[PDB]
Amino acid sequence: SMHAIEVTETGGPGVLRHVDQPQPQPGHGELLIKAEAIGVNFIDTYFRSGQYPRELPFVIGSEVCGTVEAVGPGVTAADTAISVGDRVVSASANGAYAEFCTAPASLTAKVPDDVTSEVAASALLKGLTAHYLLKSVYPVKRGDTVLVHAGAGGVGLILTQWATHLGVRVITTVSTAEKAKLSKDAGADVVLDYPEDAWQFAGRVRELTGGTGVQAVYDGVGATTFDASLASLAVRGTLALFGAASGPVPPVDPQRLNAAGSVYLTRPSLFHFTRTGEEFSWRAAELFDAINSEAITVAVGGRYPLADALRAHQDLEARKTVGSVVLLP
């Protein structure tokens, strides 16, 4: 048997039970991965809470780095260059909080030999997200200025470094002075406190951009920042609302987008930017290229035993984590 974190009923971090499960078997198109490091993602909390509904019970999580223990039967091995023994990482696994899990080969990348498994499980899901946000949702160009909320979070630090490397000025928000320094170290040109009032905060942003506003806002915080994000945009700018850490954004009168400057609102999901193995491989390769040139550096921001998934979810929801955190099996 193996250890796993199973959810039998949805609810708070408390429902994350460390239990014995049979080792899974890979199906068609799947690899069986023996975990070395397991990624923690804010979306895990939405599945745990039952926000994002899923069939019960389930072993939680989708991000894992480890070694290929087995390749699914049938045609599978003919359709991938991944082989048993390879160190691999996926953001699309089933039941990642376990010693062993499965993932589609087409949405799994080989880890470069100079990248540790902890860094890979810190980098992939959030790094693919930063990639699509910066290259596809709003393609940043040198000279732009963007706003990135939660600048010292997992996605936040990657967005900040990568945008800075691309010649983009980045303004961030964080909750503590410790996080402010990490954000500056990541390349943020200015770090602000969280908005108290949308117009007040937008004025700060306008001050910094000469009244223009930012070309794009990357908002992964949602409820507490949305109004401020919308108010901070340059004419025809893009609000990429990609997360809801503080809670869901209430229904938006489309005429607000007019008043704000004929802006665009989009709410993307990673699913729509990893639609083929070809697309996934392209983004994963650009991510590992950026890491290996030190265009970005993905630090391991926190580590927990797999059995302490509960503790990680508590710290994450309490705004106590910095950067990417991993579970260790």
Q: Using CB under 8 A, which of 184, 261, 281, 314 touches its own copies?
A: 261
Cβ atoms of 57 and 15 closer than 8 Å: no
Residue 274 CB contacts under 8 Å (≥ 6 apart), including other chains: 91, 92, 107, 128, 280, 283
User: Given candidates 19, 252, 295, 300, which one binds its own copies under the rule CB under 8 A?
Assistant: 252
Asked whether position 224 contacts ligand NDP by CB under 6 A, the answer is: yes
- Enter the DSSP assignment of 169: E
Q: What is the Cβ-side half-sphere exposure of residue 151, based on CA atoms within 13 angstroms?
A: 33
Q: Match 């894992």 to its residue by tokens.
A: 64
Q: Residue 55 is encoded by which pair of tokens? A: 């069939």
Q: Which residue is nearest to ligand NDP, using beta carbons?
A: 153
Binding to its own copies by CB under 8 A, coded x per residue (else -) over 126-165, reads ----------xx----------------------------
Output DSSP code: residue 98.
B
Side-chain-side CA neighbours of 291 within 13 Å: the count stands at: 26
Our CB check for ligand NDP shows the closer of 104 and 153 to be: 153
User: Of the ranges 10-18, 89-97, 182-190, 263-271, which one interacts with its own copies (CB under 8 A)?
Assistant: 263-271
Report yes or no: 91 and 107 within 8 Å, Cβ to Cβ.
yes
Applying CB under 6 A, among 61, 153, 237, 329 the residue interacting with ligand NDP is: 153
Among 97, 201, 242, 288, binds ligand NDP (CB under 6 A): 242
- Given a contact cutoff of 8 angstroms between Cβ atoms, the answer to whether 327 and 304 are in contact is yes
What is the DSSP-derived secondary structure letter of residue 38? E
Q: Which residues are annotated as a binding site?
A: 42, 46, 132, 154-155, 175, 179, 194, 220, 242, 244, 268, 270, 319
Give contact residues for ligand NDP (rule: CB under 6 A): 41-43, 125-126, 129, 150, 152-156, 174-176, 179, 220-221, 224, 242-246, 268-270, 316-317, 319, 321
> Which residues are near its own copies by CB under 8 A?
136-137, 235-236, 238, 241, 248-258, 261-269, 271-273, 275
